[PDB]
Amino acid sequence: MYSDQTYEVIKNRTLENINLDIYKGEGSFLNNMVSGNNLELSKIYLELSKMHKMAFIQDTYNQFLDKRVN
Amino acid sequence: LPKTEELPIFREVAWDFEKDEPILEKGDFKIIEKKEALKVWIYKCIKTNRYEHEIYSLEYGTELSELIGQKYTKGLTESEASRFIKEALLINPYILEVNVKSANFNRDILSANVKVSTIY
Amino acid sequence: LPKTEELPIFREVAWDFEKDEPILEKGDFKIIEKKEALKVWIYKCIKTNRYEHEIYSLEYGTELSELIGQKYTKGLTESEASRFIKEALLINPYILEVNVKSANFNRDILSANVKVSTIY
Amino acid sequence: PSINISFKELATTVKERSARGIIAMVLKDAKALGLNEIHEKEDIPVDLSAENKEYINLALMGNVNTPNKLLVYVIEGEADIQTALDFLETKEFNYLCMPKAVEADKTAIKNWIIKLRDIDKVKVKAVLGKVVGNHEGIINFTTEDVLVGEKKYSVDEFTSRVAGLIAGTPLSQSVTYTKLSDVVDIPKMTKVDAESRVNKGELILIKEAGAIRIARGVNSLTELTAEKGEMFQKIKIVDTLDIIHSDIRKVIIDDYIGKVTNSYDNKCLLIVAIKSYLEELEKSALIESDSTVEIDFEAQKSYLKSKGVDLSYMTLQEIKEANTGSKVFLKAKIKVLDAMEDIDLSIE
Amino acid sequence: GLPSINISFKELATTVKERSARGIIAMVLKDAKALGLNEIHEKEDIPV
């Protein structure tokens, strides 16, 4: 799940997704190109994880509880 | 009993090391084979330190830029930089060993001779 | 395993050792820090013997004044006075070691060179 | 009838320090109007203003070490330059900075500094914001719109800060590529623009190696003559040369004038002392381990020509043996061992 | 004059006697713009 989803795991996943003539190695141009976007996707995964907590009725903030009680 | 499996040829983009900009052959990046990929890898590793950029893995990077700016005398930093290059370059499985010959003192520009041993 | 705790700076009154009278800075005794308190302590210890004054502790005091008055020849009393100074000065926890170089024979005035090792 | 034991302690220092780490601070305030030498940190007079306190705080810290001595003088802004010059003449200094130095004031300061260095033989340095002068003793820091700690800073404020930082910079270390953690926000500049600015002889800040650092430590002097060379374009060389000059002048004034007479044996003793001082410098990495001290033989030739003694029919050693008339002529071979800020090696 | 100590500090630059210049090029050619010699010593500088 979200805890499993991290930069390295999705990096390996995307490297497996891409099959191409040039060899894949550390420090490659495509390696960095994919790695930056995968760091972005890790941030997105953290945001999606926080979506669960902020969506719940429990452990809400001032504005969340205000909307719910309104 | 089984013999070690040979490392497959490392293929990736190519460019002139002096140009420092990627080159395109009729839209295709130049193919690198045999003793073409390792030079690019060493150039990439030496050129930029990992500790500056969070994206790169911790094992990557070199600390030669710490000596940049004259933080210590040359006499011992010659061997220190030799050791730094050895640490930075032997991480690659393709490379076997790295040798540093000497350093030349002249004005503010330091010139050193370093050797690379390869498999192919 | 824990390292030894450093001795805090010894603070007390100050004065000129040649004046032998306490000095006051705008009503405040001069502050002694680092290598200022140990000189005062050594001066106080050497200047007066304990056995003359009942108030002082038995460990305090020096017996150099016994040699005053020519009670024995100089040849051996040189080493005897070196030992007396070593006994009188190494009692202080601050002081590490005391070294005596030599003694100069001239008329009725004996001059000797003695060394002090400190922590700060 | 009483001779007492009177013992006075003696301390020996292998390294002797003279005219180093001095900061000259002059500010225009109508309240203090006096000189204040600060040897202990967080020592702030109540008279000084908030901006002057900020200047002091900037001067407080250094890159490696706190500056050894901070000297501050206060007087009204009117006729400030004359009194500042008089006070700096009264008490020696190593570096100078002015919060409100106008272009005319900066030019006058540079003229006074170069006059001192060229006639009074007093090696002094000054840090100035925007000066195009033709001397290497002055420091020109042309970096506009500088902000430190999300706070707007004037050019002179950061010049004073950099001077204080350099005062704490050890001689083994080089000011090149020294990063500043306090500086956080700076206007974006291109690499080409920064390189062009540095090639103009200006000191600027660059964002490199994940930090904000200065690109180089060259002198403010754009035009170095043929004799001066590349090394004289660096403040690091001139700093150690000035320190050696000051130490030699100080020891000469302390010992040889008046107290010592002129003789061949006196000349040999002076040569031995100079060689010992050069060896002490050689102990530090500042200068090369190899140096020579010699009598200026051609100066002796010229002195004989002034006297008129014929050069023929005696040994050349007799020229050295001949009295110089209350004078000494010397020659020394030295080389500055200031190491390398940048490197460029080859592979195979 | 008053006799006073005067310590001189000079920089050693290796001085070698220079002979007649060699390898110079005398470029002369006609144009109608900015008449006069150009003395182009710096590399790759074409005046307008």
Author numbering:
A (entry chain o): 1 to 70
B (entry chain l), C (entry chain J): 16 to 135
D (entry chain h): 6 to 353
E (entry chain b): 4 to 51
In the authors' words:
CryoEM data processing of the post-contraction diffocin particles resolved two different substates, an apparent transitional state and a final state, which is 2 nm shorter in length. Using the same strategy, we determined the cryoEM structures of the collar, trunk, and baseplate in the transitional and final states at 3.6–6.1 Å resolution. The baseplate wedges in the transitional and final states are almost identical, with both presenting a post-contraction conformation. By comparing them to the pre-contraction baseplate wedge, we observed repositioning of the dimerization domains of Tri2A and Tri2B, along with a twist of the trifurcation unit relative to the core bundle; the dimer interface between neighboring triplexes is, however, preserved. These movements result in an expansion of the iris ring from 24 to 26 nm, with the ring structure remaining intact. Although the conformational change in the diffocin baseplate wedge is less dramatic than in R-type pyocin, where the iris ring breaks apart after contraction, it is still sufficient to initiate the contraction and release the bound hydrolase domain of the hub-hydrolase. When the dimerization ring receives a triggering signal from the tail fiber, the conformational change of the triplex will cause the release of the hydrolase domain from the dimerization ring. We did not observe the density of the hydrolase domains at the spike-proximal tube region in the post-contraction state due to the limited number of particles.
